[PDB]
Design a protein around this ligand. Sequence first.
Ligand code: MG
Ligand code: MG
Lengths: 588, 588
Amino acid sequence: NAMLYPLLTKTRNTYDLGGIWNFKLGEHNPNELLPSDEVMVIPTSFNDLMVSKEKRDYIGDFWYEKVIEVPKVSEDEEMVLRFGSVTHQAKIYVDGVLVGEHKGGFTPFEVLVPECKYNNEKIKVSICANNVLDYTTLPVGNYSEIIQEDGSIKKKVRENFDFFNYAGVHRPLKLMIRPKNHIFDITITSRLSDDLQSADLHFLVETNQKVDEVRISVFDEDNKLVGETKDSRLFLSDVHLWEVLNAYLYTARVEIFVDNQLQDVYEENFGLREIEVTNGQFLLNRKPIYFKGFGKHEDTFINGRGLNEAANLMDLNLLKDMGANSFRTSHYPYSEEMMRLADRMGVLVIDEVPAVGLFQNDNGTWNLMQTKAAHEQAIQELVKRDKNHPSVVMWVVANEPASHEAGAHDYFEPLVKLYKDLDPQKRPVTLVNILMATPDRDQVMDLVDVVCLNRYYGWYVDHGDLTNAEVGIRKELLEWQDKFPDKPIIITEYGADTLPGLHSTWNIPYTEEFQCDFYEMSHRVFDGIPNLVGEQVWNFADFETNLMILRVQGNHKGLFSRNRQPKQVVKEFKKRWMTIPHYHNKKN
Amino acid sequence: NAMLYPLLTKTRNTYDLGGIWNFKLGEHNPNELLPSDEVMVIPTSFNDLMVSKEKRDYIGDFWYEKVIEVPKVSEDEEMVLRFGSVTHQAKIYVDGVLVGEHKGGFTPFEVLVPECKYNNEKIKVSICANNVLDYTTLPVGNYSEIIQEDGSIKKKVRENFDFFNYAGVHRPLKLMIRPKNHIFDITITSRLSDDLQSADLHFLVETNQKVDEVRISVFDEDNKLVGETKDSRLFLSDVHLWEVLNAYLYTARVEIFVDNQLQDVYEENFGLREIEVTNGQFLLNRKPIYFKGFGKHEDTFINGRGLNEAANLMDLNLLKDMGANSFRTSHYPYSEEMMRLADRMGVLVIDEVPAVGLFQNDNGTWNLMQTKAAHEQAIQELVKRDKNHPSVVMWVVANEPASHEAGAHDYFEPLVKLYKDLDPQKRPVTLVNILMATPDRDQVMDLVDVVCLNRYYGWYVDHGDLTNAEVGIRKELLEWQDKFPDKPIIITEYGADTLPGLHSTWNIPYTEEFQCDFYEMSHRVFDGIPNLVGEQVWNFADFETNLMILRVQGNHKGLFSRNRQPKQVVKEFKKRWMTIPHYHNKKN
Ligand SMILES: [Mg+2]
Ligand SMILES: [Mg+2]
């Protein structure tokens, strides 16, 4: 139900509830008042703000609590709490009463404040967050309980993924006063003309109640009126297209009317562009694109997975300065803020649900992977939240699932359909593939539009041995190309752990020089694979992980450090990506 | 006029305007519409988000611009834009019309939106920021213009201080709808009883217009009503005192009434505690305190000087885990958010105005230091903003001014009076003293209540030579103690540049081991100076500076890295500061 970015309009009062909240790890009676012994900030991951390991590794319930003043709410209005997200599960209390609930740590939801409380001076909001991951959650966790002889129970999650399980309220929480009868959803659809110069627009507006009139006023980047309709249909002559690294955004002001008066007004941006996949190519505006960019993480010192709009912008500025043009939201939906920024900057985005960890670890006879419900929900929420973004060019169903094992096809078949059935634009959906699932073994890739591969020849296979890595990477890309002559291929991950300061004359893995050598070898291969249409390094920047022997205080495959300072290899990518055009047809 | 923290109340709608703004370095006609070519985030320093040096070093006008929806404003209300701060100077435009202005980069101000625009759908807000520092500004800059033969003029500021000149909108901007007749200011005063168990409270409420009734309801930490008055006076029996690292906050709900109805309601927190200085001691609640803590900076990767509430909390958590109890807002007022947090956590705060750089670089015959106006304004704004914070225990008039040169006394004499005249609590005021201004030479310290010294024997004097540094530090503290047997002494800065990873067996400056040795030597001296009542390391964390040969990519005197990871010496401070009690009377 929370699919619309919270805006301030003359009919919608939006209040930011961020700041300091009373805070507690562990159990709490929401009928009672949390002390100010512990506090926590909203938004931010809580983990790094803890000074001890035991606290940073806490798993279970933890609470945020604040007494909040009730604004003026008129008879025809209602009041909702709107969360960008709570990680991973959340129960929301008003005055000690359970009033809403959510599962999924990376998508927004709203919670209605009971009408009977609108004439009160104050309300106490209590948020019971929970950071347990399961075989029933996304991402997938290995959950276990050990009794302490205390004998309290210690909960722990052995992540089935390579990123630290940051938890907390990572995204802005809003107190939202809006009309009872309001605009629930807006879907924007366009059919571009033969020559790509005009657009037949369809604005599909959802309401809960009867409306007399629905006026839509479209404005261009100069805020000049260029179209108006009362029937949901608009024809725009001589449009400006949304082009890679050269964005053009229209904004659709939607006003609804009952009995000759404004009931609700919302402003939704859209961009005009066409996506197609054919002949081993990714077409944007009917021209062949070459992806260059990064797998990313929402990760930063101090804030962990919490939203930092300034990091979004610093990254995006660097991306574009490098000559890059895209990135993937690995391994979970990013914040709305980041999406709106990619739109504004013309950056291509591969948008993914948190389906990472779908891989067991004899044996497995019993049904342990109960992920289907969460998966279906994740897909619905992402498409409903993100479908209007011109920057979203493709969906990902999973990252590195066990796609070579029996039962894989039948799990993904309906989920891929779901993206198609839900996306008005029917964008391509992909599946990101692990090295184990080789062309012969894999049994899922027939279902998808674009082949995405994470490959580390010269790092995990043939470690530090480029001569043989080259033969391996080339061999496999040729098998993929052959098995699917039709589909485009995108390297969604490739890189090499690199610690700033480590140096060698002898191409030594972990040194800055080896990072350069690794990418040279990789690009020499890619450039000779006709159906390979894009390359996205892992990772943009170094990032936090859990304790595992092959992680040297986090992942270090970043071109930048966690503090966003460049490694040696950045100069090299800048020379390469400024030489390859965005609209680059190889083939030729 | 912006002395009250912006709150949401039933009479005050407060909207956050943060997020993405159109942005441009350089000249702009506010009657015209800024493109979305450049964007910038609010709040954040702009500098680090620039990928090129030329852009990061830009000096002059730069603009933020956004079209903003106008909320419902009733006939008895008014609409103001409220800035936490703009660095360093700001001119504010509505629809191309100049509508307000501010000088000083670290204090809040409000700007009235013209009433005639309240029935409009939208308003364009334009912010022309400026980051020039002068001989007329605080902090003090060395300003110069060189013609490029372009021939545009390149503006540059040679900072007269040791921190990078981060600029931008560092703090939240709010759109604020409030009653025409509202509560302008609340000053909270208390006289504690002989035995410190009761408090006679005086709530001084300022209004612009007539009010019929002023009701004040005080609530304790459990939100239970403990007092109520209609005459500005309240006697509270058996209070809970605000104690170091053990805070207790009351909150004063102030409601005003005209003709039997609520005109405005505001909630202001206060804490009860007594401060006194006598016999070379700093008394809190009539017990002798020992300061332990940090000089700090509002500094962080990516965001620069922009507000990051999560960094405030992570720092404060670390501070208290270390057994520390205070910090100084060097070298400028911190955000309101940080102040409210110090109150909530019981941390002592030395609150300072941006009077750093008051030092020339023959000669100087002509009046070049035109800082007096800015200085007077800074002092008024800080006291008006911060006077109610129980955590604020002392004011600083300047950091490291030329207090040994003729004319120093006469400059500071009236400014010290100003703090006294403005502070209802008449807290101590101090002056932070440079090594050049030695007991004999100095001519300002008679004016102040507490002696604050920045001393670096073993780092700037006797570099890396502890044996002789010890004799020097001891010698000087004995001269200070002798010249002012009355006043307490606080070391406000001492430390040693330390790069993480640098190691040695031989007590080598810049190594982690030397940092430890330096502090051992320093504490061995301090412990034998009876009138030395506090020690604050420079710095909490490493921080950004300009280009100067003795700065190795910033300042590295931090106990923590810029990323908040500990250096070797942290273990040592934790052992020492957990052994020294907060209420520690040496003498004895
Ligand atoms: Mg099974
Ligand atoms: Mg002079």
